[PDB]
Amino acid sequence: VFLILFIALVGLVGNGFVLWLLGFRMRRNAFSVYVLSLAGADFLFLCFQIINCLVYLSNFFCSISINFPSFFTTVMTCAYLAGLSMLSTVSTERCLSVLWPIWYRCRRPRHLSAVVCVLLWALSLLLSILEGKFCGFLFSDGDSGWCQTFDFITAAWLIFLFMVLCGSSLALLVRILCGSRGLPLTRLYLTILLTVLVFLLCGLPFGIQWFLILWIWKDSDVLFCHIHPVSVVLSSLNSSANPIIYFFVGS
Amino acid sequence: VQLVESGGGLVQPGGSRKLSCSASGFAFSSFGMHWVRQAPEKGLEWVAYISSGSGTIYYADTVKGRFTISRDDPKNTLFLQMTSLRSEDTAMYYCVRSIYYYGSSPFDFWGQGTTLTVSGSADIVMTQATSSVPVTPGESVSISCRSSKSLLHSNGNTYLYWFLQRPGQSPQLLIYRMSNLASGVPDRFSGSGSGTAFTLTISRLEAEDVGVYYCMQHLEYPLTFGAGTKLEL
Amino acid sequence: TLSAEDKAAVERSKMIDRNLREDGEKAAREVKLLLLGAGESGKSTIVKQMKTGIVETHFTFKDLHFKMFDVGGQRSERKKWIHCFEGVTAIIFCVALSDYDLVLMNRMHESMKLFDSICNNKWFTDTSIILFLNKKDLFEEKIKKSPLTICYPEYAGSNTYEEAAAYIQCQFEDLNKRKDTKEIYTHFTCATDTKNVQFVFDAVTDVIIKNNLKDCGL
Amino acid sequence: ASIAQARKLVEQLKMEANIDRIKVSKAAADLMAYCEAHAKEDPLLTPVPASENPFR
Amino acid sequence: SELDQLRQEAEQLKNQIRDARKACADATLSQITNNIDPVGRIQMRTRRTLRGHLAKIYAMHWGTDSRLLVSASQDGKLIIWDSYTTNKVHAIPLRSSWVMTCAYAPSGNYVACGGLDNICSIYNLKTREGNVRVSRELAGHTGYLSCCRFLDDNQIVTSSGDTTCALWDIETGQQTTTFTGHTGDVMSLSLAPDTRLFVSGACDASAKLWDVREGMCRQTFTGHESDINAICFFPNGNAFATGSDDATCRLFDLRADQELMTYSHDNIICGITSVSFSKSGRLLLAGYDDFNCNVWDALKADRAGVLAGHDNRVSCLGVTDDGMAVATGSWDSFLKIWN
Ligand SMILES: CC(C)CCC[C@@H](C)[C@H]1CC[C@H]2[C@@H]3CC=C4C[C@@H](O)CC[C@]4(C)[C@H]3CC[C@]12C
């Protein structure tokens, strides 16, 4: 929690700097719509992470004992789920671009990126406000009995997003190494495997511990907290990685 | 360029008539369109406005939300649809085009016209100096119209128009935007002035200048006219 | 805060903006093909089988619209209007196989000057080249009558059509300064043979694949 | 035979050769005179006040 | 051989022309322009940004009411702007997407454009039907067209890439004076203010002064070392300044038939694509290939400011006729009005 203050220093200056570059300076593709929404989701997630670390360090030093409201964790969950779903649909659209290229040049819809962006943001927001309503975060007192099934549906949703990203990157990589003539093969294969490993090692751990591992693990407070700073820090690292990978390597 | 209107006639009070103006022979889909009416013995009065591509519709502050305009681009036909025709709605409806870019001439070409018979505080008003002038042909004529608030806008363009309805004929455009003369009109005409104080200077009147002269403001809507000056011999 | 004339001027400029944007998104989906090559390379015959000033040919094939810019009638300096052709999808160079010994200085040596000049150009550094090799039957009854060693005196080979055609193919392929970016595609055909649009389609769908990675930031 | 074309080039050089050259300093002083007498009506040298500039 | 002795009388004719213009040469313009004071660092800001072009800009031409301008591009679009309110006034679809020049008529009635289809088309802006139509479509050249500029509403001179400038008449459509004499591929054109003379430049590094009415090459200037790209004519009538691929601009002079100033800098390795002069003629403004325009103190050859605002190579450039503003088009397809 000492180190999450310093990795959010590089995290906010990457996410909003994409938000300056893409909304104002540059011209947007469908992929630039995806990168803009993804950097916005990591901007909002790491803003709520840095105010949570700020109130924890204020209770450590100043001892004001102000508690942050329970409204914040719902929208933090929505930012997390939206950013990881934008990772899945970036890898899906790269697979569809190489898989059927006449479709991706000629007969692609114009507003398809914005349509599936706002629909996946709506689905992430729906799952997070249902977790807030049924889990003690919105509608102030919430029961802890039916919170298990919504954390299990959202854990199955993150498992489904991981399966979609691995299946789409696998179909992408075998369709490239089956037949390719002009491609830069090594940075392409390395970037595909690197985003698969960042989804497997930075985004997915915080979500699984919060939704599935906490309820099924059942080993109480001692490991609950220990396995909580690590995973959250990994998620912060993943957010930084989004900004230094999905736009700065390409541009 | 022809704009033959259709419809009109006689109709019951409280009735409905879809009044049409079918354009032909020009590039209608890039012109803002209007309707301007007049009474059988008074000046002109504005009806509506639709811009090209149906982006913006203003209406008269007399009748707003009861008259309804409609624009068709693949057939190049404008309609005006009218609902519950009152006793005011015996008038002479005209089908005006205009175009609005830099250097354009708004309100230049006008429809033929149809007749249909049936049994305001912040608006800038135009007041003309007279309603009839006896002046022999050959010498200089001046026609003055008043405004109630200054027509010079800070860009510089002074939105005062000068039309002419010949007796029995449709209007034309003489001077658009207070000093600029429409093409197809001979260069004997001029107009000048500063804010609200404007005159139409006609030099060397021949026999085609008989008819009623109109002044219209276009800072905002409505599009209010004067009474008009009947010129006769 | 502005007049109704200037408000309708802003609405006029907005519909002009909409029409320009839909025209550009229409025009970024056709495939532009710069046809080069010398004049007697059989390029008219490939216009009739893919079907003054610059000459433009339109044809569609498997839901892909192509645009072919025959620019051989521009008998001027190549440099100015060849910088006006960057961003083209692929280049269709045409070499007739029969003009190895046939006079104009030899024609393969001028074709290698043209091929070297467009491969080593600054404006074509990522451009695929669909090199056609034309009039192979006249190459058959010109290589059964006369050797290719008149054209290439530093060539010692089998002097049948396969080995000598592969030799002049590799002499055309070796003209790159940089072989890692440009990807040269080579085909053999004659005027009688039918399916020759498919080789063009395969080369352009590979460069559409590379540009679809460049669209998606990869 | 390029004798006619080269003779046309020779006669063009001969006709272009015999016209009058003024002195250099008179010509550059005319450049001085134009760039001195039109300096106040140059909106790009001297920055015009923004009420009079039509671009902001 | 009579042709070798005839080309050595051409060689000695070059000797009389060169020692005539060097015997009339006494002082470099810098040697008397030391007593003027420099303008120094002046800043011109992007007052307007005119977007709506998608492929690369190749030309631009300001109006004579100094408010409108036209711009031609590779995407088959000729766009007339209101430069004040950023308003697009017309957008003209071209029959040829490959256009390398455009002009706007001095009366404002017309625009021209022409490119790689060897035709300078004439478009009628003031039309009784409202849309811009093609008035006269002038096909007489065998090479591509690099400049075509209106004299009147009825006379247009047209540079081309077949060594031939050409004066036309737009009712007939037939060229009335064909200007020959260039060795390769004429790139540019700039009229005189009294419209009795024009200049043109070409790949043979020669700039030639032409006479419009009678039709022969009055003067010839050979000072550059590569392809001259664009040319501009000084407002006094007595000078002109040109621009070439060897990163050098040169100020020549008509009545003295020589070179006055050299406008190069060692930090510039890459050629010019356009030049234009200010209202007084104190600024020379040169587009470049290192993506920015330079400004030049046109009497002192200083680099008094750089109009760096573009992502790609500046194509075209131009000052209003009252000197109010500078528009610069470029290959990233963004016209920027500067002031
Ligand atoms: C679904 C609603 C209720 C939640 C919206 C969340 C808000 C904060 C933001 C975050 C990023 C935003 C998106 C950013 C990019 C674009 C591309 C633009 O061309 C269409 C709007 C769209 C798609 C925005 C929609 C709203 C959006 C998803």
PDB file of C-alpha atoms in Angstrom, chain E residues 65-274:
ATOM      1  CA  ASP E  65     -12.050  40.457 -51.233  1.00  0.00           C
ATOM      2  CA  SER E  66      -9.463  38.821 -48.910  1.00  0.00           C
ATOM      3  CA  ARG E  67     -12.064  36.756 -47.043  1.00  0.00           C
ATOM      4  CA  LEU E  68     -12.741  33.770 -49.267  1.00  0.00           C
ATOM      5  CA  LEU E  69     -10.206  31.157 -50.308  1.00  0.00           C
ATOM      6  CA  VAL E  70     -10.247  27.931 -52.304  1.00  0.00           C
ATOM      7  CA  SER E  71      -8.247  24.763 -51.710  1.00  0.00           C
ATOM      8  CA  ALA E  72      -7.681  21.687 -53.866  1.00  0.00           C
ATOM      9  CA  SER E  73      -6.827  18.241 -52.612  1.00  0.00           C
ATOM     10  CA  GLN E  74      -5.934  14.677 -53.542  1.00  0.00           C
ATOM     11  CA  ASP E  75      -9.375  13.422 -52.454  1.00  0.00           C
ATOM     12  CA  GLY E  76     -11.082  14.975 -55.471  1.00  0.00           C
ATOM     13  CA  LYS E  77     -12.381  17.963 -53.536  1.00  0.00           C
ATOM     14  CA  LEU E  78     -12.193  21.674 -54.227  1.00  0.00           C
ATOM     15  CA  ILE E  79     -13.498  23.550 -51.173  1.00  0.00           C
ATOM     16  CA  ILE E  80     -14.263  27.277 -50.989  1.00  0.00           C
ATOM     17  CA  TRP E  81     -14.050  28.562 -47.435  1.00  0.00           C
ATOM     18  CA  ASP E  82     -15.175  31.623 -45.632  1.00  0.00           C
ATOM     19  CA  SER E  83     -11.959  32.139 -43.728  1.00  0.00           C
ATOM     20  CA  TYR E  84     -13.579  34.399 -41.136  1.00  0.00           C
ATOM     21  CA  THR E  85     -16.221  32.130 -39.637  1.00  0.00           C
ATOM     22  CA  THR E  86     -14.451  28.881 -40.803  1.00  0.00           C
ATOM     23  CA  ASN E  87     -17.490  28.316 -43.004  1.00  0.00           C
ATOM     24  CA  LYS E  88     -17.275  26.079 -46.020  1.00  0.00           C
ATOM     25  CA  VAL E  89     -18.999  27.978 -48.804  1.00  0.00           C
ATOM     26  CA  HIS E  90     -18.889  25.389 -51.600  1.00  0.00           C
ATOM     27  CA  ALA E  91     -17.428  21.919 -52.027  1.00  0.00           C
ATOM     28  CA  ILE E  92     -16.752  20.979 -55.651  1.00  0.00           C
ATOM     29  CA  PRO E  93     -16.329  17.295 -56.618  1.00  0.00           C
ATOM     30  CA  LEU E  94     -13.571  16.944 -59.188  1.00  0.00           C
ATOM     31  CA  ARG E  95     -13.542  14.566 -62.114  1.00  0.00           C
ATOM     32  CA  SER E  96      -9.833  13.951 -61.474  1.00  0.00           C
ATOM     33  CA  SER E  97      -8.646  13.190 -57.952  1.00  0.00           C
ATOM     34  CA  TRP E  98      -5.071  14.042 -59.014  1.00  0.00           C
ATOM     35  CA  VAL E  99      -4.971  17.849 -58.958  1.00  0.00           C
ATOM     36  CA  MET E 100      -1.808  19.826 -58.475  1.00  0.00           C
ATOM     37  CA  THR E 101      -3.015  23.419 -58.757  1.00  0.00           C
ATOM     38  CA  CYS E 102      -5.940  25.757 -58.208  1.00  0.00           C
ATOM     39  CA  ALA E 103      -6.774  29.427 -58.676  1.00  0.00           C
ATOM     40  CA  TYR E 104      -9.575  31.759 -57.661  1.00  0.00           C
ATOM     41  CA  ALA E 105     -10.698  34.420 -60.168  1.00  0.00           C
ATOM     42  CA  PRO E 106      -9.922  38.119 -59.521  1.00  0.00           C
ATOM     43  CA  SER E 107     -13.591  38.930 -59.994  1.00  0.00           C
ATOM     44  CA  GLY E 108     -14.444  36.040 -57.678  1.00  0.00           C
ATOM     45  CA  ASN E 109     -16.728  34.503 -60.287  1.00  0.00           C
ATOM     46  CA  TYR E 110     -14.583  31.466 -61.090  1.00  0.00           C
ATOM     47  CA  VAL E 111     -12.198  28.833 -59.848  1.00  0.00           C
ATOM     48  CA  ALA E 112      -9.760  26.766 -61.877  1.00  0.00           C
ATOM     49  CA  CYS E 113      -8.080  23.483 -61.059  1.00  0.00           C
ATOM     50  CA  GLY E 114      -5.926  21.110 -63.049  1.00  0.00           C
ATOM     51  CA  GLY E 115      -3.774  18.074 -62.597  1.00  0.00           C
ATOM     52  CA  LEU E 116      -2.635  14.752 -64.006  1.00  0.00           C
ATOM     53  CA  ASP E 117      -5.441  14.485 -66.567  1.00  0.00           C
ATOM     54  CA  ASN E 118      -3.760  17.405 -68.419  1.00  0.00           C
ATOM     55  CA  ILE E 119      -6.869  19.635 -68.235  1.00  0.00           C
ATOM     56  CA  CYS E 120      -7.359  22.969 -66.429  1.00  0.00           C
ATOM     57  CA  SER E 121     -11.099  22.924 -65.776  1.00  0.00           C
ATOM     58  CA  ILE E 122     -12.943  26.195 -65.214  1.00  0.00           C
ATOM     59  CA  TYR E 123     -15.743  26.254 -62.636  1.00  0.00           C
ATOM     60  CA  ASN E 124     -18.503  28.875 -62.446  1.00  0.00           C
ATOM     61  CA  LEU E 125     -19.113  29.806 -58.804  1.00  0.00           C
ATOM     62  CA  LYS E 126     -21.894  32.365 -59.324  1.00  0.00           C
ATOM     63  CA  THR E 127     -24.526  30.161 -60.891  1.00  0.00           C
ATOM     64  CA  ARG E 128     -28.223  30.852 -61.404  1.00  0.00           C
ATOM     65  CA  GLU E 129     -28.982  27.196 -60.516  1.00  0.00           C
ATOM     66  CA  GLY E 130     -26.941  27.398 -57.316  1.00  0.00           C
ATOM     67  CA  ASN E 131     -24.449  24.543 -57.712  1.00  0.00           C
ATOM     68  CA  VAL E 132     -20.968  24.952 -59.149  1.00  0.00           C
ATOM     69  CA  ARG E 133     -20.809  23.694 -62.741  1.00  0.00           C
ATOM     70  CA  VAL E 134     -17.898  23.224 -65.126  1.00  0.00           C
ATOM     71  CA  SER E 135     -17.881  26.135 -67.540  1.00  0.00           C
ATOM     72  CA  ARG E 136     -15.033  25.371 -69.965  1.00  0.00           C
ATOM     73  CA  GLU E 137     -12.804  22.313 -69.762  1.00  0.00           C
ATOM     74  CA  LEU E 138      -9.487  23.241 -71.394  1.00  0.00           C
ATOM     75  CA  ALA E 139      -7.733  20.210 -72.913  1.00  0.00           C
ATOM     76  CA  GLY E 140      -4.650  21.171 -74.873  1.00  0.00           C
ATOM     77  CA  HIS E 141      -1.590  19.919 -73.021  1.00  0.00           C
ATOM     78  CA  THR E 142       0.217  16.606 -73.322  1.00  0.00           C
ATOM     79  CA  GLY E 143       1.794  16.734 -69.864  1.00  0.00           C
ATOM     80  CA  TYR E 144       0.396  17.244 -66.354  1.00  0.00           C
ATOM     81  CA  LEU E 145      -0.497  20.735 -65.194  1.00  0.00           C
ATOM     82  CA  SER E 146       1.426  22.434 -62.462  1.00  0.00           C
ATOM     83  CA  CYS E 147      -0.111  25.916 -62.272  1.00  0.00           C
ATOM     84  CA  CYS E 148      -3.045  27.687 -63.904  1.00  0.00           C
ATOM     85  CA  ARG E 149      -3.850  31.302 -62.883  1.00  0.00           C
ATOM     86  CA  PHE E 150      -6.610  33.659 -64.080  1.00  0.00           C
ATOM     87  CA  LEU E 151      -5.824  36.972 -65.769  1.00  0.00           C
ATOM     88  CA  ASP E 152      -9.405  38.129 -66.378  1.00  0.00           C
ATOM     89  CA  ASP E 153     -12.646  36.183 -66.381  1.00  0.00           C
ATOM     90  CA  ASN E 154     -11.708  35.249 -69.965  1.00  0.00           C
ATOM     91  CA  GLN E 155      -7.938  34.708 -69.978  1.00  0.00           C
ATOM     92  CA  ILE E 156      -5.979  32.094 -68.042  1.00  0.00           C
ATOM     93  CA  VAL E 157      -2.318  31.185 -68.354  1.00  0.00           C
ATOM     94  CA  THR E 158      -1.466  27.558 -67.655  1.00  0.00           C
ATOM     95  CA  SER E 159       1.878  26.043 -66.791  1.00  0.00           C
ATOM     96  CA  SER E 160       2.330  22.377 -67.565  1.00  0.00           C
ATOM     97  CA  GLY E 161       4.747  19.477 -67.432  1.00  0.00           C
ATOM     98  CA  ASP E 162       5.312  19.369 -71.171  1.00  0.00           C
ATOM     99  CA  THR E 163       7.630  22.434 -71.352  1.00  0.00           C
ATOM    100  CA  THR E 164       4.675  24.586 -72.419  1.00  0.00           C
ATOM    101  CA  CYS E 165       2.950  27.547 -70.826  1.00  0.00           C
ATOM    102  CA  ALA E 166      -0.248  28.481 -72.556  1.00  0.00           C
ATOM    103  CA  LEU E 167      -2.567  31.491 -72.679  1.00  0.00           C
ATOM    104  CA  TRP E 168      -6.199  30.535 -73.196  1.00  0.00           C
ATOM    105  CA  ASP E 169      -9.552  32.080 -74.024  1.00  0.00           C
ATOM    106  CA  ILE E 170     -12.405  30.579 -72.100  1.00  0.00           C
ATOM    107  CA  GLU E 171     -15.333  31.108 -74.500  1.00  0.00           C
ATOM    108  CA  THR E 172     -13.491  29.368 -77.332  1.00  0.00           C
ATOM    109  CA  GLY E 173     -11.511  26.935 -75.220  1.00  0.00           C
ATOM    110  CA  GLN E 174      -8.546  27.192 -77.570  1.00  0.00           C
ATOM    111  CA  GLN E 175      -5.122  28.357 -76.505  1.00  0.00           C
ATOM    112  CA  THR E 176      -4.301  31.640 -78.185  1.00  0.00           C
ATOM    113  CA  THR E 177      -0.618  31.882 -77.323  1.00  0.00           C
ATOM    114  CA  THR E 178       1.584  28.868 -76.704  1.00  0.00           C
ATOM    115  CA  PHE E 179       4.714  29.722 -74.749  1.00  0.00           C
ATOM    116  CA  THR E 180       7.561  27.381 -75.654  1.00  0.00           C
ATOM    117  CA  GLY E 181      11.217  27.443 -74.801  1.00  0.00           C
ATOM    118  CA  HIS E 182      11.592  25.510 -71.583  1.00  0.00           C
ATOM    119  CA  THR E 183      13.652  22.333 -71.636  1.00  0.00           C
ATOM    120  CA  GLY E 184      11.766  20.347 -69.013  1.00  0.00           C
ATOM    121  CA  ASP E 185       8.408  20.334 -67.267  1.00  0.00           C
ATOM    122  CA  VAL E 186       7.285  23.816 -66.136  1.00  0.00           C
ATOM    123  CA  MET E 187       6.342  23.923 -62.439  1.00  0.00           C
ATOM    124  CA  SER E 188       4.969  27.349 -61.615  1.00  0.00           C
ATOM    125  CA  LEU E 189       3.521  30.658 -62.718  1.00  0.00           C
ATOM    126  CA  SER E 190       3.048  34.090 -61.190  1.00  0.00           C
ATOM    127  CA  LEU E 191       1.290  37.016 -62.828  1.00  0.00           C
ATOM    128  CA  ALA E 192       2.200  40.648 -62.723  1.00  0.00           C
ATOM    129  CA  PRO E 193      -0.168  43.115 -61.007  1.00  0.00           C
ATOM    130  CA  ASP E 194      -0.729  44.930 -64.307  1.00  0.00           C
ATOM    131  CA  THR E 195      -1.119  41.451 -65.960  1.00  0.00           C
ATOM    132  CA  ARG E 196       1.123  42.208 -68.942  1.00  0.00           C
ATOM    133  CA  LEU E 197       3.880  39.781 -67.918  1.00  0.00           C
ATOM    134  CA  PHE E 198       4.308  36.503 -66.103  1.00  0.00           C
ATOM    135  CA  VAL E 199       7.146  34.315 -64.900  1.00  0.00           C
ATOM    136  CA  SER E 200       7.469  30.525 -64.887  1.00  0.00           C
ATOM    137  CA  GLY E 201       9.968  27.972 -63.620  1.00  0.00           C
ATOM    138  CA  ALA E 202      10.874  24.455 -64.633  1.00  0.00           C
ATOM    139  CA  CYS E 203      13.123  21.403 -64.121  1.00  0.00           C
ATOM    140  CA  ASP E 204      15.932  22.928 -66.194  1.00  0.00           C
ATOM    141  CA  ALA E 205      16.604  25.400 -63.297  1.00  0.00           C
ATOM    142  CA  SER E 206      15.594  28.311 -65.522  1.00  0.00           C
ATOM    143  CA  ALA E 207      13.081  31.031 -64.712  1.00  0.00           C
ATOM    144  CA  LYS E 208      11.711  32.805 -67.764  1.00  0.00           C
ATOM    145  CA  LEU E 209       9.821  36.093 -68.015  1.00  0.00           C
ATOM    146  CA  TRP E 210       7.082  35.939 -70.625  1.00  0.00           C
ATOM    147  CA  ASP E 211       4.995  38.576 -72.384  1.00  0.00           C
ATOM    148  CA  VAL E 212       1.283  37.834 -72.442  1.00  0.00           C
ATOM    149  CA  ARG E 213       0.011  39.947 -75.339  1.00  0.00           C
ATOM    150  CA  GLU E 214       2.660  39.336 -77.997  1.00  0.00           C
ATOM    151  CA  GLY E 215       3.941  36.004 -76.779  1.00  0.00           C
ATOM    152  CA  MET E 216       7.695  35.508 -76.650  1.00  0.00           C
ATOM    153  CA  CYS E 217      10.157  34.925 -73.829  1.00  0.00           C
ATOM    154  CA  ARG E 218      11.365  38.385 -72.857  1.00  0.00           C
ATOM    155  CA  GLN E 219      13.983  37.311 -70.296  1.00  0.00           C
ATOM    156  CA  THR E 220      15.522  34.153 -68.837  1.00  0.00           C
ATOM    157  CA  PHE E 221      17.051  33.664 -65.372  1.00  0.00           C
ATOM    158  CA  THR E 222      19.358  30.724 -64.635  1.00  0.00           C
ATOM    159  CA  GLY E 223      20.452  30.828 -61.023  1.00  0.00           C
ATOM    160  CA  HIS E 224      19.202  27.653 -59.393  1.00  0.00           C
ATOM    161  CA  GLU E 225      20.752  24.203 -59.337  1.00  0.00           C
ATOM    162  CA  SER E 226      17.726  21.907 -59.250  1.00  0.00           C
ATOM    163  CA  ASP E 227      14.011  21.867 -60.052  1.00  0.00           C
ATOM    164  CA  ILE E 228      12.304  25.148 -59.342  1.00  0.00           C
ATOM    165  CA  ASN E 229       9.044  24.273 -57.557  1.00  0.00           C
ATOM    166  CA  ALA E 230       7.131  27.489 -57.011  1.00  0.00           C
ATOM    167  CA  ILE E 231       7.497  31.127 -57.925  1.00  0.00           C
ATOM    168  CA  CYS E 232       6.035  34.392 -56.666  1.00  0.00           C
ATOM    169  CA  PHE E 233       6.028  37.836 -58.146  1.00  0.00           C
ATOM    170  CA  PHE E 234       6.852  40.963 -56.075  1.00  0.00           C
ATOM    171  CA  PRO E 235       4.059  43.570 -55.642  1.00  0.00           C
ATOM    172  CA  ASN E 236       6.018  46.449 -57.230  1.00  0.00           C
ATOM    173  CA  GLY E 237       6.053  44.719 -60.610  1.00  0.00           C
ATOM    174  CA  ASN E 238       9.835  44.910 -60.878  1.00  0.00           C
ATOM    175  CA  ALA E 239      10.955  41.728 -59.108  1.00  0.00           C
ATOM    176  CA  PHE E 240      10.019  38.119 -58.426  1.00  0.00           C
ATOM    177  CA  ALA E 241      11.183  35.404 -56.075  1.00  0.00           C
ATOM    178  CA  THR E 242      11.256  31.695 -56.765  1.00  0.00           C
ATOM    179  CA  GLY E 243      11.798  28.440 -54.899  1.00  0.00           C
ATOM    180  CA  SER E 244      13.487  25.153 -55.724  1.00  0.00           C
ATOM    181  CA  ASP E 245      14.323  21.629 -54.531  1.00  0.00           C
ATOM    182  CA  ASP E 246      17.816  22.540 -53.315  1.00  0.00           C
ATOM    183  CA  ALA E 247      16.394  24.341 -50.222  1.00  0.00           C
ATOM    184  CA  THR E 248      17.139  27.753 -51.721  1.00  0.00           C
ATOM    185  CA  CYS E 249      14.948  30.692 -52.678  1.00  0.00           C
ATOM    186  CA  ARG E 250      16.268  33.401 -54.949  1.00  0.00           C
ATOM    187  CA  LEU E 251      15.056  36.960 -55.491  1.00  0.00           C
ATOM    188  CA  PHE E 252      15.570  37.881 -59.131  1.00  0.00           C
ATOM    189  CA  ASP E 253      14.650  41.149 -60.821  1.00  0.00           C
ATOM    190  CA  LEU E 254      13.098  41.925 -64.179  1.00  0.00           C
ATOM    191  CA  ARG E 255      14.558  45.275 -65.171  1.00  0.00           C
ATOM    192  CA  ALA E 256      18.112  44.360 -64.142  1.00  0.00           C
ATOM    193  CA  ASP E 257      17.986  40.722 -65.423  1.00  0.00           C
ATOM    194  CA  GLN E 258      19.975  39.109 -62.621  1.00  0.00           C
ATOM    195  CA  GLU E 259      19.976  37.726 -59.074  1.00  0.00           C
ATOM    196  CA  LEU E 260      19.629  39.927 -55.997  1.00  0.00           C
ATOM    197  CA  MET E 261      19.212  37.779 -52.874  1.00  0.00           C
ATOM    198  CA  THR E 262      19.724  34.155 -51.865  1.00  0.00           C
ATOM    199  CA  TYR E 263      17.334  32.869 -49.190  1.00  0.00           C
ATOM    200  CA  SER E 264      18.920  29.636 -47.991  1.00  0.00           C
ATOM    201  CA  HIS E 265      19.909  28.406 -44.557  1.00  0.00           C
ATOM    202  CA  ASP E 266      22.197  25.483 -43.730  1.00  0.00           C
ATOM    203  CA  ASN E 267      19.635  23.955 -41.326  1.00  0.00           C
ATOM    204  CA  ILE E 268      17.302  23.365 -44.288  1.00  0.00           C
ATOM    205  CA  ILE E 269      18.195  20.291 -46.347  1.00  0.00           C
ATOM    206  CA  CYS E 270      14.906  20.011 -48.186  1.00  0.00           C
ATOM    207  CA  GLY E 271      13.129  21.912 -50.913  1.00  0.00           C
ATOM    208  CA  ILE E 272      10.464  24.601 -51.118  1.00  0.00           C
ATOM    209  CA  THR E 273       6.942  23.877 -52.255  1.00  0.00           C
ATOM    210  CA  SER E 274       5.491  27.415 -52.238  1.00  0.00           C
TER     211      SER E 274
END
